[PDB]
């Protein structure tokens, strides 16, 4: 008869926040904020939120709580031809889950290796270090060479990732069994948090979403107590208003607030589906996003205080110590800074645990949206048991992550995250933004909000959904397609054909949306105007 609901408002109120907050909030925002105007990056970061991010977040969050349908069945009630979107996202998810979990696997392997009294990445007398390995608490006067490496860089590169055993994308096999066991434990800890439905995913989030703020607080007062930490904050907040003249940093801010907010994917749709009909949507979206940004903001300090201390211990120019913009900023730089602090075991355990709890909530929701849609599209054909479907998804993602668990797995992570998944999620998000605003009608949407909340949404939001948001996504998509960034990772430049592979994976994700449009266009009898009329008008 009817579907389930939430156990408490706070459970989903923290579930959506837990999905929104992840690793990128911690480390992607501080770097891009430091190199694009410093504190002045705060100005375009908010403008792209109020006009781009918040309208998509709220508009996405409203439809779910109004229609109470999955990512697939909701299109049958809006624009059946666009039902392929609900499938596209599914395929998209299969790609996303192929790498997003492996990162956590790395953190887990770093956590289980942090139970030793002497942390592995402090000394160089290990079984994986080379002759270039030079650590501290060693002879003074040491001078760095073009070939010299640090015990942290050696530990990440040659032990956990083991990327020295592959020559690139061409030859990357085989699979590392350690990270396979790690990602199995992770795929097990997400199973028991989803298999029961929204009951456990609203209860497990209590831990996964609150721990990172505590850990960030400890790391904050720690990095604030470190000598010479003001340099990282200065480099973090130094206004460079000339960056605002470049048309690039605005696109960077737009993309950053889009992926951090994460609209258009059906996760917010599914989370909103299980909720009260008369429940407020405005305040929910507002609070959650503003926290997601604030959390990024304080995370900036959490990183740059420690990196400032690292620049003080070395010789300044935080850009030099923060050259690498990736996991290496956390797994090498930040970790090496942790190793040189008292109670290093503590600050390592809580750090990697923080990473894992940062990732878990987003993977809970990440799967939750797809599971919800599929069950809603194939009801009671499906839903006979939930644990069965959730297990069938988790295992598929595990076999889908074996390509990422290889020695040259990080390369595939970059390729899929930047050349494949990204432009496809932006594309399908653009398709949704166009469909809801220009097909279903923005006036009827404001009428639905007027039904739930009791009042029609303001003109400020209507004018955003009509024009501001679709142009907001269009600008980012066009900016990427016009000039895809040259990929580089660990002194290795990607081949020229990488963009061909990424686009191949990207297009293969939404091959379902136009072919489904052709499907319904080929299924409905009569004239094409009557078929597109039964395809544009919701089900009678």
């Amino acid at each position, epitope marked *: 008869g009817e579907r389930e609901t939430w156990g408490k408002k706070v459970d989903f109120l923290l579930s959506v926040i837990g999905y929104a907050v992840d690793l990128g909030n911690v480390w992607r925002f501080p770097y891009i904020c430091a190199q694009n105007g410093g504190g002045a990056f705060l100005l375009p970061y908010t403008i792209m939120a109020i006009f781009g991010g918040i309208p998509l977040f709220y508009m996405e969050l409203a439809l779910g709580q109004y229609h109470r349908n999955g990512c697939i069945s909701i299109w049958r009630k809006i624009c059946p031809i666009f039902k392929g979107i609900g499938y596209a996202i599914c395929i998209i998810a299969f790609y996303i889950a192929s790498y997003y979990n492996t990162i956590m696997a790395w953190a887990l392997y770093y956590l289980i290796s942090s139970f030793t009294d002497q942390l592995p990445w402090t000394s160089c007398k290990n079984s994986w270090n080379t002759g270039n390995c030079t650590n501290y608490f060693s002879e003074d*006067n040491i*001078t*760095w*060479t*073009l*070939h*010299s490496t640090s015990p942290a860089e050696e530990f990440y590169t040659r032990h956990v990732l083991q990327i020295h055993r592959s020559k690139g994308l061409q030859d990357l096999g085989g699979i590392s069994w350690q990270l396979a066991l790690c990602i199995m434990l992770i795929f097990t800890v997400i199973y028991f948090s989803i298999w029961k439905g929204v009951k456990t995913s609203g209860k497990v989030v209590w831990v996964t979403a609150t721990f990172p703020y505590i850990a960030l607080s400890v790391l904050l007062v720690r990095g604030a107590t470190l000598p*010479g930490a003001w*340099r990282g904050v200065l480099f973090y907040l130094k206004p460079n208003w000339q960056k605002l003249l470049e048309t690039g940093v605005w696109i960077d801010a737009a993309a950053q607030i889009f992926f951090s907010l994460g609209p258009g994917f059906g996760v917010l749709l599914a989370f909103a589906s299980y909720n009260k009909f008369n429940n407020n949507c405005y305040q929910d979206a507002l609070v959650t996003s503003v926290v997601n940004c604030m959390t990024s903001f304080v995370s900036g300090f959490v990183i740059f205080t420690v990196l400032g201390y690292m620049a*003080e211990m*070395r*010789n*300044e*120019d935080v*850009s*030099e110590v923060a050259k690498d913009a990736g996991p290496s900023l956390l797994f090498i730089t930040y970790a090496e800074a942790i190793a040189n602090m008292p109670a290093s075991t503590f600050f390592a355990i809580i750090f990697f645990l923080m990473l894992i709890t940062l990732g878990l909530d987003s993977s809970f929701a990440g799967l939750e949206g797809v599971i919800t849609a599929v069950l809603d599209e194939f009801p009671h054909v499906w839903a006979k048991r939930r644990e069965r479907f959730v297990l069938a998804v988790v295992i598929t993602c595990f076999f889908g992550s074996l390509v990422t668990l290889t020695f040259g797995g990080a390369y595939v992570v970059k390729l899929l995250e930047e050349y494949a998944t990204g432009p496809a999620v932006l594309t399908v998000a653009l398709i949704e933004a166009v469909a809801v605003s220009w097909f279903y009608g923005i006036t009827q949407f404001c009428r639905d909000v007027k039904e739930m909340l009791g009042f029609s949404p303001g003109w400020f939001w209507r004018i955003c959904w009509v024009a501001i948001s679709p142009l907001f996504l269009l600008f980012i998509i066009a900016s990427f397609l016009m000039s895809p960034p040259q990929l580089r990772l660990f002194q290795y430049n990607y081949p020229y054909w990488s963009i061909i592979l990424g686009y191949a994976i990207g297009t293969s994700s939404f091959i379902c949306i136009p072919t489904y449009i052709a499907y319904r266009l080929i299924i409905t009898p009569g004239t094409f105007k009557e078929r597109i009329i039964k395809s544009i008008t919701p089900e009678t």
Partner: antibody
Amino acid sequence: EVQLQQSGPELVKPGASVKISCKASGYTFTDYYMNWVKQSHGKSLEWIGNINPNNGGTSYNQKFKGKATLTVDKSSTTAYMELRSLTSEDSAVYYCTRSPVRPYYFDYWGQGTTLTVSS
Amino acid sequence: DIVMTQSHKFMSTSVGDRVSITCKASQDVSTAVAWYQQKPGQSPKLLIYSASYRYTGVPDRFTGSGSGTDFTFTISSVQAEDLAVYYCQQHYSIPRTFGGGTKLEIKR
């Protein structure tokens, strides 16, 4: 016996180009950044840019972007700097100096190259 | 960028006196200052690195001190062959800049 032997003096007409060499010896050539410092007559030193010999990893100065081009040859352990669009301001003494990654000091310098840009 | 300012373009000293050259930077530098010696007609020669540390092959009479923006290069016993132009240079932020240069003239 770390020695950096540059090329001789060059007299070139304004608007032309000039290439200066830098033969290195006495150390592992693939271990250190190779730099080029411009010193004007009676002025101070002015860092032009470095280059990574392993892959040719150049790093120029914003003041010299598009003015100097650094190359390197591992087969003979020799660095090169080319200057185009020569004017009267380019008539100065140029050095090529070895430098580690950190701390970035200039331990060994070349003998210098007196460049005269005049017709 | 960084502006390494040497206020004293010329300094006079005698054989055996204690001479100290100052170097003023734009921002805070911590301990990233190098002192080079360039004799008239020769290439610059590295003397001090990282504020105080001496390089290999440098007499003990050349010292260095300072931590922040103002730095000092000190010579205890000035010799006749110590006649050269001294330069200070920051080595933290890109690009690496130099000082104006202090031509040390000997008084007799």
